[PDB]
Write a protein that binds this ligand. Structure first.
Ligand SMILES: CCCCCCCCCCCCC/C=C\[C@H](O)[C@H](N)CO
Ligand SMILES: CCCCCCCCCCCCC/C=C\[C@H](O)[C@H](N)CO
Ligand SMILES: *C(=O)CCCCCCCCCCCCC
Ligand SMILES: *C(=O)CCCCCCCCCCCCC
Lengths: 56, 283, 60, 5, 268, 283, 60, 136, 268, 5
């Protein structure tokens, strides 16, 4: 959960130089991002999620 | 030989680099995830890793009783115009949402089923009469066997169906059931129909529901108060808890992201916006 | 017919063990051992036909 | 008798 | 290889058919399992199976669709998309039971000046959501099964309000993968991405997957193919670019049991 | 190899002395306590010592269930204007004082936790109506999991949270919990904050409580009567007892000398005079 | 899997023993053995860098 | 005595000047703009426990007739192997007059006290831009 | 290599930082000497050195400059360009003495339709000429030391005629390498060329070079980095093209002697 | 089998 004591810090992305294109080319484009865990990753204390509910 | 409670790999100390080896550069088009570890892109120290994945094994993830239904029964005065209520439930994990969502991280599964029954009762009329301790009969009626029409008809004899006679106020009832599927695994999702519509047959005749296989998949639980009618009415509820023991799962799936809407994968208008507003450059 | 297994001891006060006897004929009645195995994620994380070497170009 | 794991 | 061999340049040959490609991004074998015939230890129907081999395990090309800036995505079901393909379709409709694996080859080339990315996903049991909010699980066999033309995704859920004569079709919303789960997670399914600057095809080898060793191909689809634009098509400064997408799919190790007269389904 | 139940050292017989050896003379400025025994300053006889320190080992000092909270719940008539009371408690040893003071002889600790639940009920209105035996649900809600808003909402399904269904009048409920800290030991004292106030950020934004680490340290217990509403209202109390099993402790501290005043080390005006009058030369 | 330990017998009426079997996989479920160790108080009573000889001057 | 655990980061952390003990607890009654500082009463070791027992903590006594200094070597102590130095203090140094200063027959003696402290075996993880804390 | 490895595709990792490149022209190690710590046989100050290791030997990115058709060139001095970079700068200003080597990575990408060539030169003792013809050797410490912004070259020598308040800055003429020698000969210094059709970066590994084992980093710069357009920027038929140039530099094997209070220099 | 302390 959001917790200041166990906060993880900051991910950010910047332009190092710039995107350069020749003529006759789209000047805007998308990047897509992906996240995954490394082999040293683990979880514990099983709990119910808040990502689903059943009101009534 | 690697077990769920084994410690994860140690971090190995790694120093500076300047080479043609490019771990950081990859191509996700291939369908693969880049197998990197911190020592691939930063300088690391040696750490002896003690943490394990023991609590996220499939068994441990599911090793909990989840409520799947609440059955209502009563025992009225004999003088009532309304019949004595006995309950009938078609067995399923899809009447509630929590265990359903967990099972649906996967396409198929095999498990032994543990069912635990919690039973509570109360008075309803602002009377002052009492009731003696109730015994409940929880009868499993497999597809094909006669379903009770009355709280006291012949089917409650149970010569072959399994029944639990539970006494009120004792420890909650519990039984186990083997993997009982007619397939080699339970299908959490069936992209198909139970009938082929033929051209030479009418549309009605060839029709069937999308995604449904056996109409009566696992049968019914029928519950009754065995005690005869009592002057003061008591109403009871039987809460059923399902735990999947000795479980195996196949083919991972993205979890349910919008509210469940029936036993299928259908969704309702107005529930389709799970995500909240957050600005691209705001932490 | 007693099964004797070790516990992974977390907080401490040799190997500490525990005993299990099955009371029923049907394996369905048995408790869960929790003695489970792990596997490599590869069938999901690297499903590619040609083995990936992470220091190498993914595309060559 | 006894199995040991 | 020092003798020229590349991850990007492949040749696939099945039966009397060959596919070549010079811009691949390797190829995927779903769950690391190559297609196989049913083993005697896992067998179930006892009659001698029919195994048509090269007559059906060959590359069939479906109708080409078109990718534009307004495309929301496409879907197909297997074996349904192949139900009318040569002797595979014949062997399918003549038998009660059938099982099959597939090589799926999605084709889409453009130019070094175009951009866009197609997510190509193979989903086991790809159950899609219906168009109704009055009835669940009501998509008809005919609408569930488009054959080779497939279906499409939409960016908007729009409920069928005609209760007298309901449409009875799917209403598959793209960011919800047409089934109520978020598309960003579809990558846990076997997949490749056709990102135009990198590659012009996707190749997925699919094993037969089911909770049974063999089943009704006519009643049940084992795999779903979902193609969605993860990054939209774009070219130079044209407002209306178009490039084609072609699917070629080959059945693999297919066998059939329970021979009788041919099934003649109500498809419209 | 010396155990807690071993006998303490024997007194050795010692006779008269006249030397340069000066055990009695010392210097406490060094920070040390003079390790003397009676034979250092008086004449002793030989005594075979049988006494042991078995009951003051850390384990034995703590080997008792202490009450840490009392949770109140009820089950009213359905006709009530006020909602059915279910209880919510943030787990802690700091709501009561006795176990707290004992744990606070030390700075840090590790232990497995044994929780025992004693449950009592009574009638409140001077009625003559009865109530059938109650079943209680004690749900552990770890930090992050959905907290119940109503006695009967979806969260009580507990597919993943641990729950105890307790039957009234049976033996008090009991469960064990492992050392669950996110640190290598529990901190009885944390001289710090959970946030750094930055200059470039507002004061409000950088602020946090002194001595508090994770806001929801261990989560919540939520308790309810599972039985439906009853004409006669019954009120119940759940008393929670905590025993630290398999315990280790580090860094000794002077015990709490003035009354506790909140979860921190704060003290209230008017409670700061523990010691009583006694004259310097009066026995 | 039975553990057999001796009791320290206080009031009397050989070694008298008692038996313990763990019934659960998790060591957290176990009772306390009370088979505990003692240690020397020195880290608190003599935390000085140079070892103290009690017959000698503490300061020299 | 209106709010517990309310000492601000700025007042909890004086830097090198330190803080002082008082013989008298005196509650901050300004509720509009609270002081938000400690009120550490000396015989209660500033934390509600009796000073005579503070000797269970590592200590030395500077008794002027005997010695002119105290030297304490402190290990890193924490419930963690490493932590936020900026959010959390590991050790506290408390200096209290157990026997008051006195000289000849002067009514107002003074002698200085100087602290010199050396970090030992210090290591740091998680390098980024510099933290700029709000200290006033 | 038959497993894909290339002269053009590199990854450099120092501390918590990684640089990747897919269009390199190999990399240069000045005079074939990799950076090293000071050896006991060559040591001089006797006090225990400070060696900050990953805290300072990591990639620092300086402010990005812009290359246009009118650009005459840029220059930086080391360690001066890094004087305000994290714990490297701190360790520098707290100690009398310091020595360091560097990995210099100059970054500049464009497109297959742009052209131009940057000469990237690492010069030991890069003494630059002053703006005056009334006084020699009069460039002030402040102007000699721009920090990370660097300085620039000019195509024209223009003498500071204000004798009342002299500018006291360099006037580095490009074809004279800013020091009175011809630029065409600057290739005897360790260098690479960023020729846009070929590569998008230059990488120079610099050893500590000096007539001493260790020296005042604050008084003396060991290396100068000079970037000059050997062939001017050009693109399609645009009259005013621009592409950015970014410098990222990492100290290597740096050690410091003579710890005291921090130096607070007059920099303006 | 049996441990003995
Ligand atoms: C006296 C009580 C006896 C209770 C007997 C219950 C027997 C029926 C077991 C039902 C198994 C349900 C398994 C869950 C659902 C399936 O996964 C999916 N709908 C796919 O087949
Ligand atoms: C069904 C009932 C389950 C009960 C589960 C309780 C789990 C939470 C355990 C809480 C551990 C509390 C430990 C005591 C306090 C800590 O020492 C200090 N505040 C420092 O961290
Ligand atoms: C293997 O089990 C041989 C040793 C027997 C140990 C004692 C068994 C304890 C009681 C089990 C009763 C039977 C369960 C139906
Ligand atoms: C080691 O334990 C082997 C000897 C077994 C002795 C009898 C065990 C008594 C019953 C224990 C039942 C299992 C507890 C889950």
């Amino acid at each position: 959960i959001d917790d200041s004591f166990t906060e993880g810090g900051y991910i950010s992305v910047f332009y190092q130089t710039r995107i350069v294109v020749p003529l006759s080319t789209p000047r805007e484009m998308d990047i897509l991002g992906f996240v995954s865990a490394c082999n040293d990753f683990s979880v514990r204390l099983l709990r119910d999620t808040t990502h689903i509910e059943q009101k009534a | 030989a690697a077990t769920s409670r084994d410690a994860l790999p140690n971090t190995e100390a790694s120093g500076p680099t300047h080479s043609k080896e490019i771990p950081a550069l990859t191509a996700v088009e291939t369908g693969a995830t880049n197998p990197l570890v911190p020592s691939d892109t930063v300088q690391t120290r040696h750490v002896v890793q003690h943490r394990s994945r023991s609590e996220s094994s499939i068994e441990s993830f599911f090793a909990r009783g989840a409520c799947v239904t609440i059955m209502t029964v009563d025992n009225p005065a004999s003088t009532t115009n309304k019949d004595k209520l006995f309950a009938v439930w078609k067995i399923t994990y899809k009447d509630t949402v929590q265990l359903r969502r967990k099972l649906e991280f996967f396409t198929y599964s095999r498990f032994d089923m543990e069912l635990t029954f919690v039973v509570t009762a109360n008075f309803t009329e602002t009377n002052n009469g009492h009731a003696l301790n109730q015994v409940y009969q929880i009868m499993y009626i497999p597809p094909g066997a006669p379903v009770p029409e009355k709280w006291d008809d012949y089917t409650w004899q149970t010569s072959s169906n399994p029944s639990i006679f539970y006494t009120y106020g004792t420890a909650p009832a519990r039984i186990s059931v083997p993997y009982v599927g007619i397939s080699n695994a339970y299908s959490h999702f069936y992209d198909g129909f139970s009938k082929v519509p033929l051209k030479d047959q009418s549309a009605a005749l060839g029709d069937s529901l999308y995604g449904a296989a056996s109409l009566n998949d696992f049968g019914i639980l029928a519950v009754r108060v065995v005690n005869d009618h009592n002057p003061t009415k008591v109403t009871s509820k039987i809460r059923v808890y399902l735990k999947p023991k000795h479980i195996r799962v196949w083919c991972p799936r993205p979890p349910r992201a919008v509210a469940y809407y029936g036993p299928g994968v259908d969704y309702k208008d107005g529930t389709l916006t799970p995500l909240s507003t957050k600005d691209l450059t705001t932490y | 017919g007693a099964q004797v297994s070790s516990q992974k001891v977390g907080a401490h006060e040799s190997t500490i063990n525990y005993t299990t006897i099955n009371y029923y004929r049907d394996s369905a009645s048995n408790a869960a051992s929790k003695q489970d195995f792990s596997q490599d994620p590869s069938k999901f994380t690297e499903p590619i036909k040609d083995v990936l070497i992470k220091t190498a170009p993914m595309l060559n | 008798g006894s199995s040991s794991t | 290889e020092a003798c020229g061999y590349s991850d990007r340049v492949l040749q696939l040959t099945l039966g009397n058919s060959t596919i070549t490609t010079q811009e691949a991004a390797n190829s995927v074998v779903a769950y690391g399992r190559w297609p196989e015939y049913l083993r005697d230890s896992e067998a179930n129907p006892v009659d001698q199976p029919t195994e048509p081999d090269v007559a059906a395990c060959r590359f069939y090309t479906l109708d080409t669709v078109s990718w534009t800036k307004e495309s929301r995505g496409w879907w197909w079901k297997l074996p349904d998309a192949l139900r009318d393909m040569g002797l595979f379709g014949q062997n399918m409709y003549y038998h009660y039971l059938g099982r099959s694996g597939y090589t799926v080859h999605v084709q889409c080339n453009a130019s070094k000046f175009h951009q866009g990315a197609l997510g190509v996903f193979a989903v086991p049991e790809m159950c899609l959501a219906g168009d109704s909010n009055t009835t669940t699980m009501h998509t008809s066999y005919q609408n569930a099964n488009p054959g080779e033309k497939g279906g499409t995704f939409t960016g908007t859920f729009t409920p069928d309000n005609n209760q007298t004569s309901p449409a009875r079709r799917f209403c598959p919303v793209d960011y919800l993968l047409g089934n109520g789960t978020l598309l960003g997670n579809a990558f846990v399914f076997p997949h490749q991405i056709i990102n135009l600057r990198t590659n012009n095809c996707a190749t997925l080898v699919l094993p037969y997957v089911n909770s049974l060793s063999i089943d009704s191909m006519v009643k049940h689809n084992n795999w779903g193919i979902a193609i969605l634009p993860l990054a939209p098509l774009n070219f130079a400064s044209e407002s209306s670019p178009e490039i084609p997408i072609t699917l070629t799919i080959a059945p693999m190790c297919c066998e059939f049991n329970g021979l009788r007269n041919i099934t003649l389904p109500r498809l419209q």
